[PDB]
Design an enzyme around this catalytic site. Structure first.
Site, PDB file in Angstrom:
ATOM      1  N   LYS A  81      42.905  74.971  45.164  1.00 22.73           N
ATOM      2  CA  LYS A  81      41.769  74.176  45.610  1.00 22.73           C
ATOM      3  C   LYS A  81      41.722  74.254  47.139  1.00 22.73           C
ATOM      4  CE  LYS A  81      39.820  69.526  45.039  1.00 22.73           C
ATOM      5  NZ  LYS A  81      40.092  68.165  44.504  1.00 22.73           N
ATOM      6  N   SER A 120      36.332  67.103  41.635  1.00 19.28           N
ATOM      7  CA  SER A 120      36.110  67.987  42.785  1.00 19.28           C
ATOM      8  C   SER A 120      36.896  69.312  42.763  1.00 19.28           C
ATOM      9  CB  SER A 120      36.324  67.225  44.104  1.00 19.28           C
ATOM     10  OG  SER A 120      37.670  66.809  44.256  1.00 19.28           O
ATOM     11  N   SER A 121      37.808  69.470  41.808  1.00 18.66           N
ATOM     12  CA  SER A 121      38.493  70.757  41.630  1.00 18.66           C
ATOM     13  C   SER A 121      37.632  71.720  40.805  1.00 18.66           C
ATOM     14  CB  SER A 121      39.876  70.583  40.975  1.00 18.66           C
ATOM     15  OG  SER A 121      40.615  69.539  41.585  1.00 18.66           O
ATOM     16  N   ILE A 146      41.672  61.811  42.774  1.00 21.65           N
ATOM     17  CA  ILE A 146      41.657  60.427  43.255  1.00 21.65           C
ATOM     18  C   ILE A 146      40.668  59.558  42.444  1.00 21.65           C
ATOM     19  CG2 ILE A 146      39.960  60.815  45.109  1.00 21.65           C
ATOM     20  CD1 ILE A 146      41.536  58.821  46.860  1.00 21.65           C
ATOM     21  N   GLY A 147      39.760  60.213  41.719  1.00 19.64           N
ATOM     22  CA  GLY A 147      38.796  59.545  40.831  1.00 19.64           C
ATOM     23  C   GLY A 147      38.561  60.300  39.520  1.00 19.64           C
ATOM     24  N   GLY A 148      39.247  61.434  39.358  1.00 23.07           N
ATOM     25  CA  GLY A 148      39.082  62.286  38.183  1.00 23.07           C
ATOM     26  C   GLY A 148      38.989  63.777  38.465  1.00 23.07           C
ATOM     27  N   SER A 149      39.186  64.160  39.729  1.00 26.04           N
ATOM     28  CA  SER A 149      38.909  65.518  40.209  1.00 26.04           C
ATOM     29  C   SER A 149      39.758  66.657  39.624  1.00 26.04           C
ATOM     30  CB  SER A 149      38.966  65.572  41.739  1.00 26.04           C
ATOM     31  OG  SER A 149      37.859  64.898  42.322  1.00 26.04           O
TER      32      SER A 149
HETATM   33  C1  LIG Z   1      33.091  60.905  41.729  1.00 29.84           C
HETATM   34  C2  LIG Z   1      33.949  60.475  42.925  1.00 29.84           C
HETATM   35  C3  LIG Z   1      33.767  59.311  43.652  1.00 29.84           C
HETATM   36  C4  LIG Z   1      32.679  58.250  43.390  1.00 29.84           C
HETATM   37  C5  LIG Z   1      33.276  56.823  43.442  1.00 29.84           C
HETATM   38  C6  LIG Z   1      32.217  55.723  43.296  1.00 29.84           C
HETATM   39  C7  LIG Z   1      31.105  55.882  44.343  1.00 29.84           C
HETATM   40  N1  LIG Z   1      30.585  57.285  44.329  1.00 29.84           N
HETATM   41  C8  LIG Z   1      29.198  57.511  44.238  1.00 29.84           C
HETATM   42  N2  LIG Z   1      28.678  58.758  44.251  1.00 29.84           N
HETATM   43  C9  LIG Z   1      27.366  58.952  44.169  1.00 29.84           C
HETATM   44  C10 LIG Z   1      26.496  57.865  44.064  1.00 29.84           C
HETATM   45  C11 LIG Z   1      27.048  56.589  44.051  1.00 29.84           C
HETATM   46  C12 LIG Z   1      26.269  55.443  43.940  1.00 29.84           C
HETATM   47  C13 LIG Z   1      24.963  55.307  43.658  1.00 29.84           C
HETATM   48  C14 LIG Z   1      24.501  54.035  43.614  1.00 29.84           C
HETATM   49  C15 LIG Z   1      23.201  53.588  43.350  1.00 29.84           C
HETATM   50  C16 LIG Z   1      22.893  52.225  43.348  1.00 29.84           C
HETATM   51  C17 LIG Z   1      23.889  51.282  43.606  1.00 29.84           C
HETATM   52  C18 LIG Z   1      25.194  51.699  43.869  1.00 29.84           C
HETATM   53  C19 LIG Z   1      25.494  53.064  43.877  1.00 29.84           C
HETATM   54  S1  LIG Z   1      26.932  53.903  44.144  1.00 29.84           S
HETATM   55  N3  LIG Z   1      28.381  56.449  44.138  1.00 29.84           N
HETATM   56  C20 LIG Z   1      31.547  58.416  44.416  1.00 29.84           C
HETATM   57  C21 LIG Z   1      34.735  59.293  44.651  1.00 29.84           C
HETATM   58  C22 LIG Z   1      35.058  58.399  45.675  1.00 29.84           C
HETATM   59  C23 LIG Z   1      36.127  58.694  46.510  1.00 29.84           C
HETATM   60  C24 LIG Z   1      36.838  59.876  46.304  1.00 29.84           C
HETATM   61  N4  LIG Z   1      36.513  60.712  45.325  1.00 29.84           N
HETATM   62  C25 LIG Z   1      35.486  60.459  44.489  1.00 29.84           C
HETATM   63  N5  LIG Z   1      34.987  61.137  43.447  1.00 29.84           N
HETATM   64  C26 LIG Z   1      35.522  62.439  42.979  1.00 29.84           C
HETATM   65  C27 LIG Z   1      35.949  62.400  41.571  1.00 29.84           C
HETATM   66  N6  LIG Z   1      36.287  62.366  40.484  1.00 29.84           N
END
Ligand SMILES: Cc1c([C@H]2CCCN(c3nccc(-c4cc5ccccc5s4)n3)C2)c2cccnc2n1CC#N
Ligand SMILES: Cc1c([C@H]2CCCN(c3nccc(-c4cc5ccccc5s4)n3)C2)c2cccnc2n1CC#N
Lengths: 549, 546
Positions: A114, A189-190, A210-213
């Protein structure tokens, strides 16, 4: 702050695409030379070898390290044409090929990295313009360990911009595509790793989660992946966009074609080399006897998290593996971690954006925002008072949206202390729940099948199955178990979701048109119990896809 | 301003302590009369290892060991005021102690913050009085599962944010060697009890030196492991969720071997099961018992706190003995110590300006041993800033600490946490460049006069650095203050000559006969190697201990 425009960002993009272009040409030229000198070589037999047998033949001498290296290089070049998963060829890797320690546990194994894994003389851009033309001064710790184990890191693979996404596109190297279907995300993200390994172009890769990557691209591309406990492996030298956030732990781990490959990689990494190079990693050796155990398990399970409605394929995959585990003599116990909405909306979201996303937004000054990020940048940029106001209005009808938005506001150090304590307490809560049911492991749905391109950034709710275990910092791994049937896909017309908000609406459309795509299940164990999690993953693989073993 | 709650809390606490001591007294007199033939003096002078072997063989009964130590604890408390609470149900745990336990029949003293079912963990604070714990903490459970018998709660300074040992509830703990001296803190009661023979083994906590100060001051051994080597589950504290500067718990005892046994016994399946968040690292005997020559980094001063003549002598003598024993001694000083102390350590401990901490003091007395801490933290942020850059030209230590005790954003905390990670990495890189195994350090000593640690904050420099770094660090007694050492305190000036230097100069005087220690440091997760080095220092400096 004064508007600086996009001219630097555009220059970075042309420079980056040239480096990618030049990389692939160099790859092609190297493999053409080799093939010319070896017309005898059976490419297709070599590439279909399970890693364990590949390693075995490398070790015996039956296969030369050059033969397997150039054959994989050729395949990786080939699959990249339909996926755009490779960002850079690691040019010096032919010297490592010659220097590779012969007694190393990964002797002669080509490994994909990665892009965030720093490699000497190469950018780790993260799709961010400000990181273009900033080459790493050295290999990161885990790369050093891989080389010491005789592996040959050969490519950097693509990531979504900044890595805060489970899609896979950036303004520098463009968009990565699922090998199974070009209209679908490979996940992230991977993402690059998933696309590459999933199409046969790499026998083993390293990602971060860190969130499912690690788990998203594994599930979307039909490969296995493991997210260990945050500090089981060294993060030293890993390129990130935000530093100092310790509430929700970052993890790194292997991705490959079978669980045995994941276990070998862990075994290779968990050595004196790692524990010396990074003293902050607890010197926990791979426990072979736990991994190899054949004792019956007490398996907790759930069909849904009551937060993200499982697709018909997800639900079927879970039920089927539950039934096969029961038939194999294991005891299956209904179990759902308590207070999941809290873990996601306040703990996870709050832990990731404690500063309101300010540190994160610094990386985007002067840069394009990739469409796959959706409205994340727009939302984080909003003043704190306005985030609060919208949250209040959104709350009665759309509680999910309101809670996420409120938790993405900046706070004091005082409130971060409070939040960090709450995460510690929640972790002990779910552990007590687990122990009271006397579980060994936990079986959960894994988000699938692959979402359409540019939809993950608009379906944030869908991270619920994975991020729960980053918050809890439990080892969690993913294994393909079934494929989407016509019946599975047709039932998406009946899909509603539990909230009916914008996230549920996107997801309903995003999971359609998926007949034939892989669907996974998720395996979970307690902190530091990677070997047990792998033991469980091995069992699931054996029952659901026995030909892999 | 109103103090009626606080007075009520103190009245109640004192009654409970008095009743605890009376219960101890009655139980001891009863046992002594039923067993007059028992050589109690011989019992009490036995090293723990010999004590546990006799217990395991049946030569000594758990009852004999228990009530003999209980009697001694009662006697030493009279002069020290180190015991706050008798853990009453211990007499039944005694009869049920698991027979093959590694600590079978061993009475263990517990710092007050270790939750024990049915007892308060007050931390000397009114708000925690009459709020008894409803579970034993994890390490207590593990001790019992190993056959040990926790028998007392021991005194701490108010709120535990001190290396003195007084609170308005149970009052002041005194050093057993000299009544006008502090026993150290915050594990001060443990220091006094063990240091006077009243307990063979105890558990303390350490975030700024709270195991190492009382061990040094009272002349015992103590180890502060890496933060997460042991379970903090069920540990009472007055601030939660601070992770920048790692809190650690660990053993205190009369010899190094006792610390190793305790660590070995805690590092078991029971612990790893009861708290899965703790990495299941078994005690590696091969590392602890190694006789290989060591590459030993050393410094005799951190150029922040001027060592007392006794400290300096202790350091140089053990350096010389290690050299003669065949180890290689390499000059080594962690980079940027003032920065690590003034911005990283101070800033990490007080990232919220002390707001969370101050909540525990509403309507409560502020114990004199805390000095000006509460008054200083209560100051508005703008005023802390104002005083800081006014003091900076004259007194840069006082200014730096004051500025770092201001509240900040989550964003600035992330930045600080990142700098702490980077700093750790920079010392590790230094360590590796010299190819060290281990690090030898001075330890603050001899014991300070009562009510002075709260006014000599600079003196935490030798200890707090390794909480910031999160390296295992232990202390071992190596010498006592001679009159020669003591007289030389008249030439002590400190490096800064600020109020902290002035107080420390006076505070370390009149210390003839007092114990002086040295500090042993290893890399994270290397407790066994830290103990191996401690065992070496003990052997060379005090051979009759082995
Ligand atoms: C997937 C992922 C995250 C997510 C965490 C939650 C927040 N988020 C996100 N992304 C896009 C749109 C929105 C939102 C849209 C919206 C609309 C109305 C009200 C509130 C909101 S929040 N949020 C990214 C993340 C965070 C930190 C590090 N790695 C991350 N990854 C990698 C994986 N797997
Ligand atoms: C010892 C100790 C601490 C100390 C840390 C540094 C701050 N501090 C303190 N105490 C008393 C007075 C002062 C000051 C006085 C003063 C005057 C002028 C300008 C600035 C200042 S700061 N500071 C307490 C601590 C913190 C958190 C947890 N456990 C702690 N311990 C247990 C030990 N060992």
């Amino acid at each position: 702050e004064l508007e600086t425009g996009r001219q630097k960002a555009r220059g970075a993009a042309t420079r980056a695409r040239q480096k990618q272009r030049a990389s692939l040409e160099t790859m092609d030229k190297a493999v053409q030379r080799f093939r010319l000198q070896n017309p005898d070589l059976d490419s297709e037999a070599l590439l279909t070898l399970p890693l364990l047998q590949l390693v075995q033949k490398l070790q015996s001498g039956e296969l030369s390290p050059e033969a397997v290296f150039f054959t994989y290089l050729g395949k990786a070049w080939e699959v990249n044409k339909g996926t755009n998963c490779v960002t850079s060829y690691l040019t010096d890797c032919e010297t490592q090929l010659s220097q590779a320690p012969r007694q190393g546990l990964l002797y002669g194994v080509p490994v994909s990295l990665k892009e965030c894994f720093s490699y000497k003389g190469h950018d780790s851009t993260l799709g961010l313009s400000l990181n273009e033309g900033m080459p790493s001064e050295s290999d990161c710790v885990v790369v050093q360990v891989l080389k010491l184990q005789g592996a040959v890191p050969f490519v950097h693979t693509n990531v979504p911009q900044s890595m805060l996404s489970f899609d896979c596109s950036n303004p520098l190297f463009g968009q990565t595509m699922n090998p199974w279907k070009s209209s679908k995300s490979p996940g992230g993200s991977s993402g690059g790793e998933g696309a590459l390994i999933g199409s046969g172009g790499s026998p083993l890769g390293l990602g971060t989660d860190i969130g499912g990557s690690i788990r998203f691209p594994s599930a979307f591309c039909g490969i296995c992946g493991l997210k260990p406990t945050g500090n089981r492996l060294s993060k030293s030298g890993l390129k990130g966009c935000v530093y100092g956030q310790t509430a929700v732990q970052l993890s790194l781990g292997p991705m490959a074609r079978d669980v045995e490959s994941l276990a070998l990689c862990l075994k290779a990494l968990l050595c004196e080399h790692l524990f010396t190079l990074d003293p902050t990693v607890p010197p926990l050796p791979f426990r072979e006897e736990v991994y190899r155990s054949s004792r019956p398990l007490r398996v907790g399970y759930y069909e849904t998290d009551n937060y993200t409605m499982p697709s018909p394929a997800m639900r079927r995959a879970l039920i089927e593996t539950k039934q096969r585990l029961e038939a194999a003599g294991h005891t299956l116990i209904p179990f759902l971690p308590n207070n999941i909405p809290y873990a996601l909306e306040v703990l996870s979201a709050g832990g990731l954006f404690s500063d309101g996303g300010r540190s994160f937004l610094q990386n985007f000054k002067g840069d394009f925002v990739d469409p796959c990020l959706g409205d994340l940048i727009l939302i984080l940029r909003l003043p704190s008072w306005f985030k609060r106001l919208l949250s209040l209005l959104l709350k009665p009808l759309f509680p999910r949206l309101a809670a996420f938005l409120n938790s993405m506001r900046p706070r004091s150090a005082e409130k971060l202390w409070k939040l960090q304590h709450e995460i510690e307490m929640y972790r002990q809560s779910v552990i007590a729940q687990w122990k009271a049911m006397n579980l060994d492991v936990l079986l959960t749905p894994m988000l699938g099948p692959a979402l359409d391109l540019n939809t993950p950034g608009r379906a944030t709710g869908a991270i619920s199955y994975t991020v729960l275990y980053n918050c809890l910092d439990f080892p969690a791994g993913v294994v393909p178990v079934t494929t989407v049937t016509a019946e599975d896909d047709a039932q998406m017309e009946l899909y509603k979701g539990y909230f009916g908000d914008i996230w549920d609406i996107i997801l309903k459309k995003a999971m359609k048109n998926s007949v034939g795509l892989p669907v996974a299940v998720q395996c979970v164990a307690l902190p530091w119990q990677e070997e047990l999690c792998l033991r469980f993953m091995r069992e699931v693989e054996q029952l659901m896809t026995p030909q892999k073993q």
